[PDB]
Structures are given as structure tokens and as C-alpha cells.
Design a protein around this ligand. Sequence first.
Ligand SMILES: Nc1ncnc2c1ncn2[C@@H]1O[C@H](COP(=O)(O)O)[C@@H](O)[C@H]1O
Ligand SMILES: Nc1ncnc2c1ncn2[C@@H]1O[C@H](COP(=O)(O)O)[C@@H](O)[C@H]1O
Ligand SMILES: [Mg+2]
Ligand SMILES: [Mg+2]
Lengths: 336, 336
Amino acid sequence: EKIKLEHGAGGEIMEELLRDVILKTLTLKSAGGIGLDALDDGATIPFGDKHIVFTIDGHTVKPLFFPGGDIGRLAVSGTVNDLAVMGAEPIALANSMIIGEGLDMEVLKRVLKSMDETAREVPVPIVTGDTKVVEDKIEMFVITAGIGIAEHPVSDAGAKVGDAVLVSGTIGDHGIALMSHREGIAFETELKSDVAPIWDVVKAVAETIGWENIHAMKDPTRAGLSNALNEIARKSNVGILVREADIPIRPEVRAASEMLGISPYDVANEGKVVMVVAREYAEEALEAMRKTEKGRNAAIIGEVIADYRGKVLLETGIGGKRFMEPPEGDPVPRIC
Amino acid sequence: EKIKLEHGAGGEIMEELLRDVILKTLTLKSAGGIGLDALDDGATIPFGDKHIVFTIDGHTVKPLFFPGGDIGRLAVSGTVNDLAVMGAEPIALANSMIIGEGLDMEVLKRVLKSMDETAREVPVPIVTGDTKVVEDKIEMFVITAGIGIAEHPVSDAGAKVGDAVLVSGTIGDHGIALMSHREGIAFETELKSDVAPIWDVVKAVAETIGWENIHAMKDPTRAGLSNALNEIARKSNVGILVREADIPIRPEVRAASEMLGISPYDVANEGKVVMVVAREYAEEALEAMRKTEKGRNAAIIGEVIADYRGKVLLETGIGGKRFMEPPEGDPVPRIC
Ligand SMILES: Nc1ncnc2c1ncn2[C@@H]1O[C@H](COP(=O)(O)O)[C@@H](O)[C@H]1O
Ligand SMILES: Nc1ncnc2c1ncn2[C@@H]1O[C@H](COP(=O)(O)O)[C@@H](O)[C@H]1O
Ligand SMILES: [Mg+2]
Ligand SMILES: [Mg+2]
């Protein structure tokens, strides 16, 4: 048996590798809180009356620079966002770079400048790192780890019947922008990735409704909104019912996805959060998001239900329903 | 200007890249304690009456499996050792893997099993991670980040005049074993790498003499003992005088290094610590190390002096001296 691209594509095939190989081989997997077996956006460690949150993400996107961002902005944003969806204020990043021999020094400078600018938006410092140079023709991979502090960690398994399901903005932007750029599809301007740190959106909600009323979150990166909703449903052992008409999609992203023959629900987002909140605070949560710049297009898209446990239903027309199936993997190669 | 292999070789050429490009481009570099500008083995963050210590290391060693270890054992050991030389008890690791499409699943299983076994020696859990699969023919890169807790962080800049300089064991084992394996040099058995987690050696000393009497430590990985001593001298603004005869070198490593035409002082070690301790506790520190299995061959090799600030002197014969020059880089390609 050989490793396939699908094993790193963030969908069901990767999930099989994680459960059958990684989780079964590693034995020490928790430091006292959320650990590897939870397969959440990060891990947690009790520390005093708070929790340290710990995450890591590798980035192998091609091309390194794309409309709306680059591998540097992606590296900072992805790690900040993984901490944010665990309920953690980011406190430090670590930056590993693996660089192909012969890369232009100016490329490395541009990547670092983008990391710096993106980190300053949070704000969060890059406090340690590592650099390796290899003969392989890879251009550059960037791997960032993050530490945050959470007073009240939020899992992807805490959804309750009756809760509202929100997204902080338009869906499909990153994956579709990257595929569109590769295919030469563009409108009045090129479609831009949404890549950005969204700790401010999560914090805004928590400051309004309290951490206890945010029941679950996921960062809908690899394999998209569909993967994220399916994971929350499965891990929380609940059903999720979403109204297709209420899911925000940028008009240009809708058009490009049709041309590409790919669903915007199935591709990576890099500046969005999926959030599940107590029914009675759903409108307060939505208003808090829409007050921020990065959450300006937020919407309530669904609700958690008692039946169809572990499944996600899409409602269309005047009430008809079908399953929103978990992707086998992200249909976009080298997307992040 | 292009990125060269030397830029990742852990010596003076890498130091130039760090100071002229990375440190000058990144602006947010500290979370309140030791930060990026210190260029130490890790960073520190005040937390209550203790300090969180944070480190990251990428591993691109070839071949993946070598005498005495593999990339999995290297990934766990290197990160644990970086935390240990900051004075930190390891509490959690994060595991990023980037895998070449087509790698045998059995190779991935073997690597993970080695990580598991090595982590269990510490003991320290692997609590989060990431997997990417790329088309590039890289086999596998492993990037690990670590979190530890230190009551009293130890810098590489705290050496004082009169202090003793110790190493926890034989010097040059890893780099020379890897080069010997590539060249087909072997004795009754193949030379083994020393790769191993050495938190127990550091802890043993601290439990004996107290953290306050350990003034500096470095993990002598890339560019070897020579690089580590030069960095401590330069950052502490002191001279270091070492007696060549007192530096422990395995007889087989000495022989192989001669055949290879490479100094054992200039190549990576993966199971060793360089430690600088208060003069009056040097013998207690040495005894504490030699009581452990991994520190069994520890030696006092030198002392910190007031002149030749920023330099390292090697004493030979009956008193003659020359400089131990900082390497331009590790003379071993793809060593870690
Ligand atoms: N190579 C790996 N080692 C350990 N844990 C992993 C690895 N790859 C993924 N994970 C975990 O699997 C889940 C999904 O990974 P990600 O694709 O980073 O969201 C997260 O909980 C990760 O911590
Ligand atoms: N790409 C990078 N980004 C940020 N810091 C780095 C990078 N590479 C190395 N460093 C820092 O430079 C020092 C030496 O790196 P290392 O070779 O990992 O010992 C350490 O303090 C690292 O944290
Ligand atoms: Mg995530
Ligand atoms: Mg180090």
C-alpha cells in the first residue's frame, strides 16, 4: 500500500489514515486535556485556572503567491485560526521553513514580509523557528506551530440539539480563487482568496454571548464547509440541518465554481469560522460577527437536530432535503 | 542572490541569513521573555510563576533510517533536547509530516513507531499534528514543535568568568555515523548515531546543583560542538578555553573522521548537551551526569575566561593554544 495525495486532502481518506494508522501507532496522545484522539483543531493542556492550546500546520501551497495572499499569510492565518476555533487567544507562533536550494532571496524576503504584516494584524509574535535548505525542487514549505491561552476551550464535539449553526462569511473563496487562477478564469479582477486571521471575529462573539454559549467551532479549511459540518455532526452525535439558500456565496465564486465543475462547499476556506451557539444567543452572535470587518457577511445557516445523528442535511426549495456528503478529499490539489 | 545549502547548515552562513534577513524583516519577535532576537534554542513566555518554553525543528535527514536511529527518533529527540537546554520539562509535542506521494505505508508506520517509542522514553505525549502529501519526490520531512515548562529558564548567554564547561558525552557520533554509513565505512559493527532525548541528563544536574548554578546550555546539533561553544562565547561575551585532550571522542569516531577528513567537533550531535556551570558545582554536575546512562561519558572540558571575549581556544600538548573556529556550516549534507 502506498501513500496517495488523497491521504493529505483533509477528507474521508485522510480520516481513515488518521484513525487506522496514526492514532493506532502513537500511544501517548494527551497532556491532560483535549488530545490527539479527539482529532480537533488543536490540543489543550490545563495550566492554572486556564488552558494552553497548541496547534501545528504545514503549508505546501502552489504557487507561493496567489490572488489575495501567499504562503506566508496562509501560514500565519491558518495557525491563528486553529487557535481561535479552540477558543484561544494567540500568544506566540513558531516558524519552520524548508527551502529548495536556488530559491531567489527576494522570494524569501517577500514571504517573511507577508508573515510579518499578517502577524501584526492579530497581533501575535513569531518567537522561534527553524530553517532547512534541501536539494529537492520544492521552492518552499512553511510549517507554523501556535500557542494560545483559552479560559474556556471550545471543542468540535459540543454541539447540542436546538443550537444555531453560523458561518462568519462567504464560502468557497480560497479554494475557488486558487483553482480559478490556475485555469485563467477571472472577471473584472481576479477572484481573491479570503486568507486572513479571524481571532477578532471569534473574540467578538465570546465578548457578546460568553464562551459557555459557543458550543462548537471548526476551521473549515481542507475539504471545506461540508467536511467541517460533517465532523461537528459526527463528533457531537447530532444531526445538522442547513438551508442552502442561507449559505453566503460570492456571486463570482458561484460562477467560477460552475465553470470549474466543483462545489464551493467542498473546497478550503482560509478566513472563515463555522460556529455553533446556544439557540437563544444566535441573533446576538450573528450581530457581533457582522459588526466586524472580517465577519461582515456572516449568516445563520442552520440548526442542530436530534435525528440523522452524524449527518448533515441540506434544505432547498420549499422544504425538500438531501444529504451534504463529506468529501473524500479536497478536490483542489496543493490548495494549502 | 540565491538560497544555498549553506544557509540551512547551522553555521556562520546561516547566522548571516538570520541576522540580515529574518530578524530584520520580522517585527513582532517576543511574547514577553526570550524571543527571536536572542536566537536561542527556544523562546520563553512568562506564565504565572513559571515560564512556557516553545521550540520548533524541521527534519530532512536522508536516508530516513540510519544506524542508531531514524527521522522519527530524531524528530522527537531534537525537540525534547531543545526544550531541555532551555531548562524546560517537556509537556507536549506537535507533529507535522510532509510526505511524498507514493511512499510505502510501511515506511510511515515504522517512522511513527519510532516516534512513539522515543516519546515514551521521556515520557512526553504527541498531542496534535498535521499531514500533507506532495507530488515532489521527497520521501518524508518531519517537523516537530514542543512546549515545556521551566521554573528557571537557561539561556545560551549566561556564561560567567570562572565557570566550568561540560559536555554530557562523546562528540561527533551522529554526524560521523551518518557520513560513515554513506561512505561504507564500518568496523566490527556500523557506527551508531547517538540520537536520544536527554532531558533526564539535564534534570539530573538541576536536581543536584539547582537551576541557578547552570548558567548556560546549548544543544550542539548543526555545525557541532565548535558552533555551540562559539555561540555561547559570543552571546555571553566571554572567552572559552577548552583542553582538547579532555573532549571525549569515541575511538571509532576518531578513526572514521580521519578517513573522512572531517573534524568531529564540526558535525551534528543528536544526544548531547553542552553545559556551563558555577565553578564550585562543576564536580557535582559531572557526577550527576555520569550517574545517568545517557551522560555516562560526560566530561569537564574547559572553563570560561575573561579575555578572548567571543572566542574559543583549544589547548593542546603541555599548554599550547589555538582558536577553535566556528564552522561556515555543517560539512555533512542532509545530516538532520
Ligand atoms: N501526522 C500527524 N500526526 C499527528 N496528528 C495528526 C497528523 N496529521 C493530522 N493530525 C491530527 O488530525 C486532525 C486533522 O488534521 P488537520 O488536517 O491538521 O486538521 C488534527 O486533530 C491533527 O492534530
Ligand atoms: N525560518 C526561521 N524563522 C524564524 N526563526 C528562525 C528561523 N530559522 C531559525 N530561526 C531561529 O534561529 C536560531 C537558530 O535556529 P536553529 O538552526 O533551529 O537552531 C533559533 O533561535 C531559531 O529560533
Ligand atoms: Mg483546523
Ligand atoms: Mg538548539
